[PDB]
Amino acid sequence: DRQHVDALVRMSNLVTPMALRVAATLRLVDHLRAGATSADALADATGADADALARLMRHLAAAGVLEEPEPGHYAPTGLGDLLADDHPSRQRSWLDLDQAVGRADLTFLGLREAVRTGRPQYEARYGKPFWTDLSEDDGLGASFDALMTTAFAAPVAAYDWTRARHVLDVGGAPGGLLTAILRAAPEAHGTLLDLPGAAARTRERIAANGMDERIDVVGGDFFDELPVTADVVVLSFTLLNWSDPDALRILGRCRDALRPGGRIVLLERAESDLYFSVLDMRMLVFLGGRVRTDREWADLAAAAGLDIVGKTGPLVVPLDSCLWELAPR
Amino acid sequence: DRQHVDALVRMSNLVTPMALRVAATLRLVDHLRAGATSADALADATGADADALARLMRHLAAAGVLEEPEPGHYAPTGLGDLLADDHPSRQRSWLDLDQAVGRADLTFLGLREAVRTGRPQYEARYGKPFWTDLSEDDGLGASFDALMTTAFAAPVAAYDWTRARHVLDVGGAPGGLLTAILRAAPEAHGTLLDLPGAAARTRERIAANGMDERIDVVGGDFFDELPVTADVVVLSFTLLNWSDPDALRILGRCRDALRPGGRIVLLERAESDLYFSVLDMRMLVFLGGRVRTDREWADLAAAAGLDIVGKTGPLVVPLDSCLWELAPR
Numbered sequence: 135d136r137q138h139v140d141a142l143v144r145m146s147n148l149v150t151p152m153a154l155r156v157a158a159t160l161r162l163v164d165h166l167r168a169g170a171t172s173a174d175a176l177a178d179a180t181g182a183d184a185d186a187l188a189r190l191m192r193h194l195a196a197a198g199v200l201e202e203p204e205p206g207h208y209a210p211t212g213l214g215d216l217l218a219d220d221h222p223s224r225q226r227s228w229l230d231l232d233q234a235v236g237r238a239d240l241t242f243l244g245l246r247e248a249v250r251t252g253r254p255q256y257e258a259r260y261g262k263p264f265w266t267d268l269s270e271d272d273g274l275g276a277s278f279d280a281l282m283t284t285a286f287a288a289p290v291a292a293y294d295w296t297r298a299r300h301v302l303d304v305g306g307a308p309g310g311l312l313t314a315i316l317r318a319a320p321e322a323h324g325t326l327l328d329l330p331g332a333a334a335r336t337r338e339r340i341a342a343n344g345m346d347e348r349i350d351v352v353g354g355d356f357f358d359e360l361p362v363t364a365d366v367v368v369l370s371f372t373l374l375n376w377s378d379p380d381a382l383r384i385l386g387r388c389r390d391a392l393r394p395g396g397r398i399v400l401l402e403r404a405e406s407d408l409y410f411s412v413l414d415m416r417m418l419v420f421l422g423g424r425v426r427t428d429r430e431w432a433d434l435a436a437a438a439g440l441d442i443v444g445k446t447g448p449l450v451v452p453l454d455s456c457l458w459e460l461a462p463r
Numbered sequence: 464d465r466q467h468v469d470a471l472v473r474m475s476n477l478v479t480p481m482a483l484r485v486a487a488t489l490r491l492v493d494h495l496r497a498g499a500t501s502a503d504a505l506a507d508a509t510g511a512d513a514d515a516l517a518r519l520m521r522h523l524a525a526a527g528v529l530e531e532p533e534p535g536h537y538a539p540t541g542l543g544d545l546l547a548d549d550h551p552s553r554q555r556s557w558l559d560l561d562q563a564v565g566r567a568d569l570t571f572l573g574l575r576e577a578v579r580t581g582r583p584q585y586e587a588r589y590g591k592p593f594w595t596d597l598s599e600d601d602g603l604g605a606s607f608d609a610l611m612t613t614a615f616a617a618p619v620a621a622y623d624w625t626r627a628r629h630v631l632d633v634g635g636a637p638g639g640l641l642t643a644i645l646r647a648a649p650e651a652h653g654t655l656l657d658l659p660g661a662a663a664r665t666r667e668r669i670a671a672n673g674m675d676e677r678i679d680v681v682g683g684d685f686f687d688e689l690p691v692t693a694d695v696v697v698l699s700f701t702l703l704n705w706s707d708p709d710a711l712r713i714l715g716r717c718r719d720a721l722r723p724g725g726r727i728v729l730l731e732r733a734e735s736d737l738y739f740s741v742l743d744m745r746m747l748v749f750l751g752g753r754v755r756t757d758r759e760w761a762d763l764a765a766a767a768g769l770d771i772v773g774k775t776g777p778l779v780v781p782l783d784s785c786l787w788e789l790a791p792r
């Protein structure tokens with residue numbers, strides 16, 4: 135069928151999504167807006183090949199991203215203007231192959247192996263798994279944090295944080311949630327554990343915010359014994375990026391760190407199809423893990439020797455969240 | 464702007480084009496049509512991971528390729544039925560990562576390096592350049608030839624082949640054009656040169672067609688001295704996949720092989736934007752070369768010590784062709 139074939143071919147297009155990411159990485163639209171509109175001028179500005187750049191811009195013009203106001207000279211359309219570095223959509227940074235999201239999206243090249251094995255393929259491409267790479271590379275981690283900002287009031291209200299004297303945030307970088315908890319709970323002291331590079335950036339952030347007397351930052355690995363005990367151990371959007379066997383290892387380390395009467399608190403994603411499926415596929419291919427159902431959290435808790443003693447949610451940012459309270463059996 | 468942002472994000476989608484290729488490679492829709500419709504049944508049939516397959520099919524359902532008639536059981540939509548192996552669109556084979564086109568399309572992962580260097584990136588990924596890989600791998604070469612079939616009457620009529628006693632087809636696999644020329648020219652004998660693996664497949668084809676007394680097949684490299692002299696040396700859709708420096712090397716070998724009075728004959732692509740640009744981008748990234756203008760062919764001929772003594776075209780299959788006659792100066 136002609137309509138079906140044309141639809142499938144449009145849906146199969148790898149050239150345009152790659153062309154957009156290369157253009158973003160080259161700051162192509164910024165150069166065009168500055169008057170470097172020929173392939174030769176763009177080659178001088180970027181270091182790339184003039185003939186190949188001409189062919190790239192021909193393609194982006196055919197896709198409606200650019201126009202050709204003079205022979206051999208390109209300029210952004212209204213659509214292409216979204217790739218300007220200062221555009222409020224930040225689409226240039228979402229697509230930039232030298233920032234964390236564009237870099238990670240290239241791992242979809244390895245989708246066949248992700249589907250064969252069920253394992254993420256970012257480490258296969260880059261030599262370190264995703265969170266470790268962003269920790270060890272200040273530029274990558276900071277770029278991810280900047281994009282993902284675009285007040286933690288709901289989780290601060292959803293739990294009585296004034297009853298917790300010592301709080302340990304496991305995988306807590308960049309420290310926004312723990313900072314909000316402690317500003318609402320004067321009697322609480324915090325410890326934040328994350329990988330060493332991410333922890334160092336968080337330590338600098340906390341000091342610049344005047345919270346270094348309220349929060350100790352520790353660089354380390356949450357698959358290892360945790361560095362302190364605590365009355366509440368917080369896992370905020372951490373377990374969702376791990377398999378059930380790995381999440382059980384993390385929960386075990388957290389349960390071992392509980393003081394008498396202590397609790398583990400999960401802040402997690404709550405349990406249109408296309409948007410949610412793209413997020414799920416990013417989890418399969420490079421972020422790790424999956425979004426669990428309420429039943430799956432109960433099963434995970436039981437396998438960790440934990441009772442679910444409370445759930446508060448949905449907490450309503452495009453996605454909703456849930457706060458879970460877990461206690462040792 | 465909301466409309467622009469939504470358009471750019473749709474255009475940026477790498478998940479769906481990769482999901483389609485993985486599904487094609489797994490023969491997923493064929494398995495569903497055979498009743499293996501759960502992730503567990505599909506894992507048994509394919510060897511892939513059941514949980515990852517479930518997430519793949521969720522995505523393809525969200526994209527309109529599949530539906531979920533029973534909980535946990537998927538089936539193709541009318542769109543998805545195009546991925547059945549026996550569908551006349553052959554879209555499963557166009558997308559199959561174990562056939563030549565899907566395998567090559569993954570090289571668009573390396574578009575950044577193609578744009579930086581101007582060089583194709585297939586050899587970087589697979590260890591051999593495209594035509595060499597298809598020559599050395601009978602399955603890949605045969606899959607490409609089968610897809611690209613979907614009578615050579617125009618080029619046979621466009622030149623007086625009855626005046627050529629000895630014809631050499633340089634890069635002539637799979638041999639269709641030379642076979643058509645010789646069936647129209649009783650006084651002509653042919654020699655066909657291609658890489659050894661492609662030449663062996665062509666030799667078998669020619670023998671099965673009863674043309675082995677009319678055509679000698681030689682395995683070799685057209686950057687080397689050619690194996691025979693000839694009255695007409697034919698380059699049919701060969702020079703377009705090479706840079707000007709490489710095309711000049713090939714033209715030099717061809718000019719050296721001309722008998723007195725001999726001619727070189729080019730059958731080439733003639734000089735909607737989106738379709739042609741995708742073809743151009745495939746040339747940049749893995750096929751090699753570019754489509755030249757009439758002016759560029761004249762410049763190439765002059766740099767090779769050749770006069771253009773005739774052009775016959777356009778010859779009208781979606782694309783048009785041109786026949787060029789070249790003579791030593």
Ligand SMILES: Nc1ncnc2c1ncn2[C@@H]1O[C@H](CSCC[C@H](N)C(=O)O)[C@@H](O)[C@H]1O
Binds near residue numbers: 305308328369370
């Ligand atoms: N093995 C490990 N040990 C400690 N932290 C880890 C880790 N693997 C991943 N992480 C950290 O897990 C965090 C997940 S994203 C940050 C979640 C944060 N608690 C929030 O609410 O937003 C990252 O900061 C990452 O560096």
Ligand SMILES: Nc1ncnc2c1ncn2[C@@H]1O[C@H](CSCC[C@H](N)C(=O)O)[C@@H](O)[C@H]1O
Binds near residue numbers: 637685686698
């Ligand atoms: N170095 C080389 N030496 C000989 N043949 C080569 C070669 N590099 C590529 N080729 C061959 O060039 C051909 C280009 S496609 C085949 C073109 C054919 N003449 C036609 O009309 O359809 C392929 O068969 C490929 O194997």
